[PDB]
Motif scaffolding. Sequence first.
Motif, short mmCIF file in Angstrom:
data_model
loop_
_atom_site.label_atom_id
_atom_site.label_comp_id
_atom_site.label_asym_id
_atom_site.label_seq_id
_atom_site.Cartn_x
_atom_site.Cartn_y
_atom_site.Cartn_z
N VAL A 190 45.66 -47.10 -19.19
CA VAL A 190 46.71 -46.36 -18.51
C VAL A 190 46.43 -46.49 -17.01
CG1 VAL A 190 47.70 -44.10 -18.06
CG2 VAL A 190 46.92 -44.67 -20.38
N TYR A 204 39.19 -35.15 -17.21
CA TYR A 204 40.62 -35.08 -17.02
C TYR A 204 41.05 -33.71 -17.54
CZ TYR A 204 39.81 -40.07 -16.69
OH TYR A 204 39.33 -41.31 -16.33
N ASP A 249 51.72 -37.80 -10.88
CA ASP A 249 50.72 -38.35 -11.80
C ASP A 249 51.21 -39.30 -12.90
OD1 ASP A 249 48.04 -36.63 -13.64
OD2 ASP A 249 48.39 -38.76 -13.19
N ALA A 260 49.83 -38.58 -16.39
CA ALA A 260 50.21 -37.35 -17.08
C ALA A 260 51.49 -37.64 -17.89
CB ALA A 260 50.47 -36.23 -16.07
C1 7IG Z 1 44.97 -41.48 -18.39
C2 7IG Z 1 43.94 -40.47 -17.87
C3 7IG Z 1 44.51 -39.10 -17.63
N1 7IG Z 1 44.97 -38.93 -16.36
C4 7IG Z 1 45.51 -37.77 -15.98
N2 7IG Z 1 45.94 -37.71 -14.72
N3 7IG Z 1 45.64 -36.70 -16.78
C5 7IG Z 1 45.18 -36.85 -18.05
N4 7IG Z 1 45.32 -35.75 -18.85
C6 7IG Z 1 44.59 -38.05 -18.56
C7 7IG Z 1 44.26 -38.15 -20.03
C8 7IG Z 1 45.36 -38.40 -20.87
C9 7IG Z 1 45.22 -38.52 -22.25
C10 7IG Z 1 43.95 -38.41 -22.88
N5 7IG Z 1 43.79 -38.52 -24.26
C11 7IG Z 1 44.87 -38.76 -25.26
C12 7IG Z 1 45.61 -37.51 -25.74
C13 7IG Z 1 45.60 -36.29 -24.99
C14 7IG Z 1 46.29 -35.15 -25.44
F1 7IG Z 1 46.24 -34.03 -24.69
C15 7IG Z 1 47.01 -35.16 -26.65
C16 7IG Z 1 47.02 -36.37 -27.39
F2 7IG Z 1 47.69 -36.42 -28.55
C17 7IG Z 1 46.34 -37.53 -26.96
C18 7IG Z 1 42.83 -38.17 -22.04
C19 7IG Z 1 42.98 -38.04 -20.62
#
Ligand code: 7IG
Length: 329
Positions: free
Chosen positions: A29, A76, A215, A218
């Motif tokens: 991402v 995060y 973001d 997000a």
């Molecule tokens: C791409 C990195 C990232 N960047 C930002 N700015 N915010 C985030 N919350 C994350 C981030 C997003 C998804 C995940 N994991 C995946 C996921 C998360 C969730 F909250 C529910 C789901 F089903 C799957 C981990 C960190």
Amino acid sequence: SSVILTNYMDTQYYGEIGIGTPPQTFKVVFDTGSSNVWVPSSKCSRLYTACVYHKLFDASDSSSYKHNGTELTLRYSTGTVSGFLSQDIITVGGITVTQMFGEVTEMPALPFMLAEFDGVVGMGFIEQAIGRVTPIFDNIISQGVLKEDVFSFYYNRDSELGGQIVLGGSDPQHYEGNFHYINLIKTGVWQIQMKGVSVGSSTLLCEDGCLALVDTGASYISGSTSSIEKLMEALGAKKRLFDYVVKCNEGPTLPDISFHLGGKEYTLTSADYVFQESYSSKKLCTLAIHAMDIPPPTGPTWALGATFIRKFYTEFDRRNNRIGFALAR
Ligand SMILES: CCc1nc(N)nc(N)c1-c1ccc(NCc2cc(F)cc(F)c2)cc1
């Protein structure tokens, strides 16, 4: 240079990068909300089920790898990963750059077992880089090949191209009208001032002003718990453990939601923010908006993620320290 992105359920947008020699492929991402690059490591214990289900970087198979070893933890809003730093060549849409990145050895099943992507490529500023590692975009800028000190994001609606990131400019084929820019409230964070948030005919939120983190990493639009509770009561939405739902039959008639940015109103219709998967009054439909209390110094702040970007093509300008929006096409 542009990177083609895959759209997973309107919540995860990712593209591919290649690391090492020969190249080891990874789904990542591109996140303006963070500044580090990381992918799962071959050194990640298999007791971490998330590591069993993702592509793992194996340094011992790369001849261009350069060891470092400094420990690092990246946290995060929805999860944390931990590991160590390494260096190797990374290929990003035709561009090749030697980059320092994290080899993750600790990757919690929740939420990473729910992650279609393998890792993350932070598009944020060095100021927010953990371990003060030089961000990949700065390393590309140093090469002196990009025509512009900017990168652009296009996130498509689900279907069946899922999206597209352009490094060095914008793709006119994916936006119309002209950009409108808002200067950053400070360098080191892709955050801008927001002059207000209106639901239906009533700027019942962010009066007096507030912050907006743009973001790309997000999935939704987020606001402080307080703000969101007020936004949702106005929507007649009910809160669950992780989100807000509305009776699906009510989805279509929910009011518009606008965000006042840089003297321009950015409006989303209920179709833009509700996951309309049925029209049944007996079913619940989730909203692509929810609470997210971002801690200082960044927060308190709203976050404009994929829900917002789908409608507005976004250009991040490093040279002029501002963000530009245009109607996505
Ligand atoms: C791409 C990195 C990232 N960047 C930002 N700015 N915010 C985030 N919350 C994350 C981030 C997003 C998804 C995940 N994991 C995946 C996921 C998360 C969730 F909250 C529910 C789901 F089903 C799957 C981990 C960190």
